[PDB]
Amino acid sequence: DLSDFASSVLAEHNKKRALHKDTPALSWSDTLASYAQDYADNYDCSGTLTHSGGPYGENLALGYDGPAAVDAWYNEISNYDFSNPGFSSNTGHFTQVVWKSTTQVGCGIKTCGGAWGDYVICSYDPAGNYEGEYADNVEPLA
């Protein structure tokens, strides 16, 4: 059985994906979550967000618990132009949350407290945000 962290974060992803046409639900991966939590264990609580360079897709946040980070990522839909699909600096988290071809997610968390609060990383497989593939993987609202 999943931890409370895993079940709450998975539900928050799949509540949002179900808003979109032809977009399957994700399942949780212990492999992805071990990778994510290992990286969080090593965060320096400095306030900067640097990507891991790994083999999986990746969303990062600072200042939110797990489900609250998912909500912030998904709210980027407000900036996304469905008639000009593609990457942008303030829609790249949203397009990975709903990426049609992604099938599994796993996440980790570390409590920095102080000025920064919680660090959250979610890892995804297959990865989203491939150039030339947005129109086929980022579907409109049902």
Residue numbers in the entry: 158 to 299
Give sentences from the paper.
Two crystal structures of the CAP domain of pathogen-related yeast protein from Saccharomyces cerevisiae, Pry1CAP, are presented. Our previous studies revealed that Saccharomyces cerevisiae CAP proteins are required for the export of sterols in vivo and they bind cholesterol in vitro. The sterol binding and export properties of these proteins are localized to the CAP domain, which is sufficient to rescue sterol export properties of cells lacking endogenous Pry proteins. The overall monomer surface area for Pry1CAP is 7125 Å2 and its topology is an alpha-beta-alpha sandwich made up of 6 helices, 2 disulfide bonds, 12 beta turns and 1 beta bulge.
Electron density for four 1,4-dioxane molecules were observed in the initial molecular replacement 2Fo − Fc maps when dioxane was present in the crystallization solution; this density is absent in the Mg2+ structure, which does not have 1,4-dioxane in the crystallization solution. Density corresponding to one 1,4-dioxane molecule was observed in the 194 Å3 volume cavity created by the CBM, confirming for the first time the ability of the cholesterol binding site of Pry1 to bind a ligand. In one structure a 1,4-dioxane molecule from the crystallization mixture occupies the CBM cavity confirming its ability to bind hydrophobic ligands. Since a 1,4-dioxane molecule binds to the CBM cavity, and the CBM is verified to be important for cholesterol binding, the effect of 1,4-dioxane on cholesterol binding was tested. 1,4-dioxane inhibits in vitro binding of [3H]-cholesterol to Pry1CAP in a dose dependent manner. However, the inhibition was only observed at relatively high concentrations of 1,4-dioxane, and is possibly due to the increased hydrophobicity of the 1,4-dioxane containing solvent compared to the aqueous buffer. Interestingly, 1,4-dioxane does not bind to other lipid binding sites notably the palmitate binding site of Tablysin-1519 or phosphatidylinositol binding sites of GAPR-12324. The presence of dioxane in the crystallization solution was incompatible with the formation of complexes of Pry1CAP with cholesterol or palmitate and all co-crystallization and soaking experiments yielded crystals with dioxane only. Mg2+ dependent sterol binding by Pry1CAP requires the interaction of both binding sites, likely occuring via dimerization, because Pry1CAP forms dimers in solution, and both crystal structures have a crystallographic dimer in which the CBM and CAP tetrad are connected within a large 7063 Å3 volume cleft.
